[PDB]
Design a protein around this ligand. Structure first.
Ligand SMILES: [Ca+2]
Ligand SMILES: [Ca+2]
Ligand SMILES: [Ca+2]
Ligand SMILES: [Ca+2]
Ligand SMILES: [Ca+2]
Ligand SMILES: [Ca+2]
Ligand SMILES: [Ca+2]
Ligand SMILES: [Ca+2]
Lengths: 213, 213
């Protein structure tokens, strides 16, 4: 039973429906009459009706917007039957992949993350980890590929950039030194998560670092 | 035989060969080991060896650069057998479309075109036609959409731009008044054709216009 190269249909389509994807067709339709149908989840089983097939020509259509983040791949079967009811083909297994769009913003595991460092640790010691998630397609695109930046430090002394964040790991480390509890005892960092490798959709959270003796 | 939706492969690929197109696979391989082959012009018949299928995996592969302007479509059949060589599927018909690149420069029908106009003619009167052809795919791309321009006018009197060319059609026109046979009896224009609607590959030729009483 052949399985068909995947038919791509992007999520969140808009406008008039139904829309044509792709024609599936027996080359025996000059020998005898051929009537097409499809079965499976997305066709005659839940969700019913997302895809339909023009009985007579074999144009496969989609009848509504899709959401990759709810169903990413549909498997159906097509059938080719003649007037006398005989099968003109074995069923063909039909694979449809929902193609991703970047329609989910990253989200931080917490709105405020807490750590602490020692006064005289050392430019590149580990303070804490911040983390986001993105629900988009981490396998075939960058839409869920998260770059952590630092947006602002408070207060800005002794110098701006007392800290850095590793843009992939979200691990926060000491960048320059002169950390002095008694001059400046807590810092409030605004941290950013952005997909498209830094360029895309973004969100912010807070990291509150307590300077210790 | 089912005919599957066409697989696109662009002309003029560069780099490492063979390149993978698409996995053509039987779902009957849970039961028994399956072995795949292909046939047709471009596989086992001339041009032999353009496409191959990997026997155990069913990856379909193209083995060299294609040229849309020599062959635009291939038709193959895939086949599926078990260790003993018996068939576990009917064959599947496989269509392959070669997609276009802008690899053809427009050519003028002539190197020098000839035309004429009456001294008295009013701005807007049509003088003559220049015309070019492009061999790229004028049905699905812009690689053949030609735009025309006048590059230079000799002589430049009584004004620059005695003439104009309609930039979709190649119709050359009287633009401003003052044509007088007895002061300037011919003009030589350099005309240009460029595809991608003017932004792409270009060529030039000459238009010679005799001003008549
Ligand atoms: Ca979605
Ligand atoms: Ca998405
Ligand atoms: Ca995203
Ligand atoms: Ca101190
Ligand atoms: Ca070519
Ligand atoms: Ca071409
Ligand atoms: Ca061209
Ligand atoms: Ca005159």
């Amino acid at each position: 039973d052949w399985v068909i190269p995947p038919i791509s249909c992007p999520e969140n389509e808009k406008g008039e429906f139904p829309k044509n994807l792709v024609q599936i067709k027996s080359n025996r339709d000059k020998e005898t009459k051929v009537f097409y149908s499809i079965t499976g989840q997305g066709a005659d089983k839940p969700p019913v009706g997302v895809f339909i097939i023009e009985r007579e020509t074999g144009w496969l259509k989609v009848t509504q917007p899709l959401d990759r983040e709810a169903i990413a791949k549909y498997i159906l079967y097509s059938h080719a039957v003649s007037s006398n009811g005989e099968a003109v083909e074995d069923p063909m297994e039909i694979v449809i992949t929902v193609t991703d769009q970047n329609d989910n913003r990253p989200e931080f595991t917490q709105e405020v993350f807490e750590g602490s460092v020692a006064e005289g640790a050392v430019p590149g010691t580990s303070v804490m980890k911040v983390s986001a998630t993105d629900a988009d397609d981490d396998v075939n695109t960058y839409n869920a590929a998260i770059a952590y930046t630092i947006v602002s430090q408070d207060p800005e002394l002794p110098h701006k950039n007392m800290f850095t964040v590793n843009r992939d790991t979200g691990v926060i480390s000491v960048d320059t030194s002169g950390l002095d509890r008694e001059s400046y005892p807590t810092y409030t960092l605004v941290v950013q998560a952005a997909d498209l490798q830094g360029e895309g959709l973004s969100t912010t959270a807070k990291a509150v670092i307590t300077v210790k003796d």
